[PDB]
């Protein structure tokens, strides 16, 4: 009804249960004016959005119809690592049922994708990803209830011969970015707003591309980070979203008109190829070229809603009982990536911590590219980066580190079991930059 906007089909819980069979299968699709066979969940790119409420039961049966094994990571969900099992393999032709309960305090935007080590980057790049939304009682206050809500899945692509483009040697070093910069699987869609206040849930599901988001003539009001609400709205002129990160923003359209949502130039330290003999800046790739993500059309005579005065207070965290240091390094030409000097070994436990305690983690990027650090199972609070305070309080599960930056994270250890932490430039994860945490 009214103007259409491309957006994944939503599957909702009913009577406290979301039970769904989801097949991972090669799928011919229409895309950017052409036909391509992608790897998809549920026959769509992106996959379907699962929408639940706290205390719901999720029962998702993943049906592997791919030519290779796979698994699922429930990215950002603070559940058991015996469910969110990074070491599980589902062979081709087999199924596996993931069952869990949505925690009572959780809210925001999460996502699911493959996590079979060694094959994450080709599988995610081929199209295997979908969103998960946890509704909150806060969504009922008038300042959010009457906003026009949309999910925006930011994910680029490159095609060759009607299939996802193959990974090159440069791709394993830099991470793979595509030439088709898509929103919900569409090339530069147009959103004809019917309300003057929009609530946009944003997901960077790209392998490696960064999105320095800016809306023409408008600020963004950040109300949620990766894993939950902020304490109150935070006005920003632009918002950088690293791979794996999510955010929710309100947009207040004041004037009629058509406004571009753009991914402004950002230099994440990727490296170019060689030869040379010039006068200025080469060798690095330098900043991304600017991209138009979508066109936003404001409604007639727009009067936006007032902003909410407060959102969700952030929990007081106890004093930490241990401090950890995790140093990220790289060898670019070999395209190998390390944590404290070692590459991932699934038979090696790297950190041993205690359930029901809080730790400080100091994560130090001693490389030259941005690396976005992700910890499964245990959401954290970013204290500082580079010795300066983080700009808000909210649960995160991905923190971006530029060259030489050190992040101090407060990590409450929740569920027992064995889980992982890794760079979410998933090529780097495939090429070494992952370690194992065991909680007892
Ligand atoms: Cu992830
Ligand atoms: Cu990395």
Short mmCIF file of N, CA and C and ligand atoms in Angstrom, two decimals, residues 73 75 111 113 424, ligand 1:
data_model
loop_
_atom_site.label_atom_id
_atom_site.label_comp_id
_atom_site.label_asym_id
_atom_site.label_seq_id
_atom_site.Cartn_x
_atom_site.Cartn_y
_atom_site.Cartn_z
N UNK A 73 26.02 -18.18 12.79
CA UNK A 73 26.36 -17.39 13.95
C UNK A 73 25.17 -16.47 14.22
N UNK A 75 24.58 -13.37 15.46
CA UNK A 75 25.52 -12.28 15.77
C UNK A 75 24.88 -11.29 16.73
N UNK A 111 21.84 -9.98 13.72
CA UNK A 111 21.80 -10.64 12.42
C UNK A 111 22.40 -12.04 12.48
N UNK A 113 24.41 -15.17 10.03
CA UNK A 113 25.29 -15.37 8.88
C UNK A 113 26.16 -16.60 9.14
N UNK A 424 36.03 -8.73 12.23
CA UNK A 424 34.87 -8.90 11.39
C UNK A 424 35.09 -8.40 9.98
CU1 LIG B 1 28.81 -11.34 12.56
#
